Design an enzyme around this catalytic site. Structure first.
Site, short mmCIF file in Angstrom:
data_model
loop_
_atom_site.label_atom_id
_atom_site.label_comp_id
_atom_site.label_asym_id
_atom_site.label_seq_id
_atom_site.Cartn_x
_atom_site.Cartn_y
_atom_site.Cartn_z
N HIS A 164 -10.18 -7.34 -4.53
CA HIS A 164 -9.93 -6.27 -3.59
C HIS A 164 -10.46 -6.60 -2.22
O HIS A 164 -11.36 -7.38 -2.10
CB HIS A 164 -10.61 -5.02 -4.11
CG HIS A 164 -10.73 -3.91 -3.13
ND1 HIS A 164 -11.81 -3.78 -2.30
CD2 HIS A 164 -9.91 -2.87 -2.85
CE1 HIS A 164 -11.66 -2.70 -1.56
NE2 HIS A 164 -10.52 -2.14 -1.87
N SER A 165 -9.89 -5.98 -1.20
CA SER A 165 -10.25 -6.34 0.19
C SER A 165 -10.38 -5.10 1.06
O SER A 165 -9.67 -4.12 0.85
CB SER A 165 -9.13 -7.22 0.79
OG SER A 165 -9.32 -7.41 2.19
N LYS A 191 0.88 -1.16 0.00
CA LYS A 191 0.00 0.00 0.00
C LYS A 191 0.92 1.22 0.00
O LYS A 191 1.63 1.46 0.99
CB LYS A 191 -0.84 0.02 1.27
CG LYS A 191 -1.71 1.29 1.39
CD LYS A 191 -3.15 1.04 0.95
CE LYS A 191 -3.31 0.56 -0.49
NZ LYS A 191 -4.74 0.49 -0.93
#
Ligand SMILES: [Cl-]
Ligand SMILES: [Cl-]
Lengths: 417, 417
Positions: free
Chosen positions: B315-316, B188
């Site tokens: 995606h999470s 990220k």
């Protein structure tokens, strides 16, 4: 009572059948006196048999056997795996072209329908419950009108009589609609000059002022001719289907047509959607589970159409009660399938399934609530239509070849006008 | 033993819960000390309860109650109808925008998952069998790495330690990968200058030479900056996710990037696909059943991507074991979902379901073979996390607001570089 909570395929019986068809005309010829289908009986180690129905040309039967062999030993719930095994077996690559993927989908389809039938039977659910559930109780169909001869050469004339002009076409509609109650009407054109087909359409409009109307000449016209027809039928047609050949031509016509264009010819496979969408060639796509790869893939097609702003209808070829049951469950469970579905039903009078589950009433078929597909084989009827297949000697559909056997110089040219 | 062969919804219990989350950084702030979720228990007249899991913001809880009320009295197999009733109830219109349809899908999703759970339970089938069947036995996940503080202000530091540079990021990877076995790694970014994030990526590559790598700065960069990053990471990343804001910017970057671009931000609803496809903005779409409208609609998304030549990942957001079970069944049954799925799993240490069904081993979770979703509520754990929700006082996710409560002048500007 499934060991290892497993219900898997032990084998499949493919039975080709043939049933009487009138001399219906289209832009490439005339229907042969028997239409062909293959019945799939899919057997499992639970003693449950599921039903599917497909084409019966020579090459297709061979593919169906290779498929049947490849999927022995698979769970009827593993339909993703089953498609992949059929793709490997056919050595496949997993507009209007029959790609390797299109071949795979035509071969997989009847096994997929039979799998869902077994799934429904074993779970106690109708097939529509496996597809997101019904959203309507009954599925409306169209009256599928054809110009036609009175009889096949040297045979007894059928009860319809010939239809070769607006009067004959209107009389055909009246008889069909009195028997079945259809509330929408489709004319198969590309047979007579466009002005004469426009006149049949106008006559139907006058005879049935509230019936939505469609016209499909199977790409028999140039773009310039199609625009003239569309202008002349403004406010008369619900859609104009495949007026002209090719995505570019269809896009040209669509830009000028006041009604939406529909297609089944330019978009018959998933790999053809992106170009159809990019070019704006059509506004309505006709689904058909028989070549899109069965019911779940037809639901995927319906979702893609919804997502890209395309209307959804349904295409038909001469078919029997197994296909009809699958069409109905599919359409009942599809929210954006609101056009009346095409069917050739009125044109046959034979079947392979027990009667009672697929009655038409006011143009529509109630979706069966019983577990599975909702119809079952009548083994005597099946043996009889198989026998009819063997004896009639027809092994491939060939509208043009059959027309030439009567009129040797006949050509399947197009466009014609 | 269902009267009228009917199993229908009698009510739903929505339980908001809160579980500890470390101070993970992203381009708009830092995670709050508790993440929120809502557990759906969907009750039926067969005494079977299905599970779903979603967000728990104030407005969402209200919508979930309106939905729960609207669908009482519906078959758990009628998921098409159930979506439409929820749409009517929300008064909805049935890039990256939360349209009325997107709201409907976020509200419907957990009820749909709970419906499939009940369907599987009543039929004896795992959920993956309702989605075309599993095509793989186990689903691979990625290690989801974040820059992070050592502790929330004034709280005990967690066992991870801070990660604020390449060394810290590599140590985090090592600990996560030793515990879970992930074979793909995601960073990220959008937190430190791109050159420092490129250095973390290069350090991960050196430490884990065989692990596919991804980087996601949540649109923190201009197109010009994104192209420099992509050039500098040529041959290093499996894909670059949402480097820059907007479909046009993404298309500009994609034309020059040697690796595919992925997105979850620009395409979060079906109505956004046509423009994404027309512009060539992305090559990979991240699925997420929580906002695409549940598992069947996620399968539709996967089919659309396949049809239009787009890769598919997942995606999470911070989530618990109900979402995890749904993710696994979905991914197991999706042929073109071959990228490792994102998960926040390593970041929490609490759950609402009984343990044992979702073990990671070598980076992957075996798909449960039991009927339904494969996990069941632990009522004591659920009560405890609900109590934690009530007491912690957090009612909406607010990374930026929480960052400002610590550093008042903080802005969630972007792009930043
Ligand atoms: Cl299997
Ligand atoms: Cl219902």
């Amino acid at each position: 009572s499934m060991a290892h909570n497993r219900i898997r395929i032990t084998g499949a019986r493919v039975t080709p059948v043939a049933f009487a068809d009138p001399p219906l005309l289209n832009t490439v010829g005339v229907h042969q006196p028997y239409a062909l289908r293959a019945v799939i009986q899919l057997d499992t180690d639970a003693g449950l048999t599921g039903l599917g129905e497909t084409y019966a040309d020579t090459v297709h039967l061979e593919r169906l056997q290779a498929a049947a062999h490849a999927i022995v030993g698979r769970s009827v719930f593993s339909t993703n795996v089953i498609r992949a095994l059929i793709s490997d077996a056919l050595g496949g690559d997993r507009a209007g072209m029959i790609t390797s993927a299109s071949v795979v989908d035509r071969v997989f389809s009847p096994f997929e329908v039979a799998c869902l039938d077994v799934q429904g039977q074993v779970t106690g659910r109708p097939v529509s419950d496996l597809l997101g559930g019904a959203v309507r109780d009954a599925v409306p169909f169209s009256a599928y009108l054809f110009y036609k001869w009175a009889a096949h050469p040297g045979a007894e004339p059928d009860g319809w009589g010939a239809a070769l002009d607006p009067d004959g076409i209107v009389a055909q509609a009246r008889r069909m609609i009195d028997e079945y109650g259809f509330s929408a009407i489709k004319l198969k054109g590309g047979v007579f000059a466009p002005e004469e087909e426009m006149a049949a359409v106008e006559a139907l409009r006058a005879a049935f002022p509230d019936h939505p109307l469609r016209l499909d000449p199977n790409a028999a016209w140039t773009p310039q001719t199609s625009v003239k027809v569309a202008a002349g039928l403004e406010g008369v047609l619900e859609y104009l289907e495949d007026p002209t050949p090719g995505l570019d031509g269809m896009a040209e016509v669509a830009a000028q047509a006041p009604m939406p264009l529909a297609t089944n010819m330019c978009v018959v496979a998933f790999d053809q959607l992106p170009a159809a969408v990019a070019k704006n060639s059509v506004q309505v796509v006709l689904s058909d589970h028989h070549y899109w790869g069965g019911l779940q893939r037809s639901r995927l097609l319906a979702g893609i159409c919804d997502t890209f702003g395309l209307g959804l209808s349904m295409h038909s070829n001469s078919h029997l009660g197994i296909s009809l049951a699958a069409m109905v469950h599919l359409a009942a469970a599809t929210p954006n399938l609101t056009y009346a579905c095409d069917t050739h039903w009125p044109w046959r009078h034979e079947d392979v399934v027990a009667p009672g589950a697929l009655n038409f009433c006011d143009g529509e078929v109630q979706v069966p609530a019983t577990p599975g597909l909702g119809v079952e084989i009548d083994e005597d009827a099946l043996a009889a239509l198989h026998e009819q297949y063997l004896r009639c000697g027809i092994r491939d559909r060939d509208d043009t070849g059959y027309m030439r056997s009567i009129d040797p110089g006949f050509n399947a040219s197009g466009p014609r006008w």
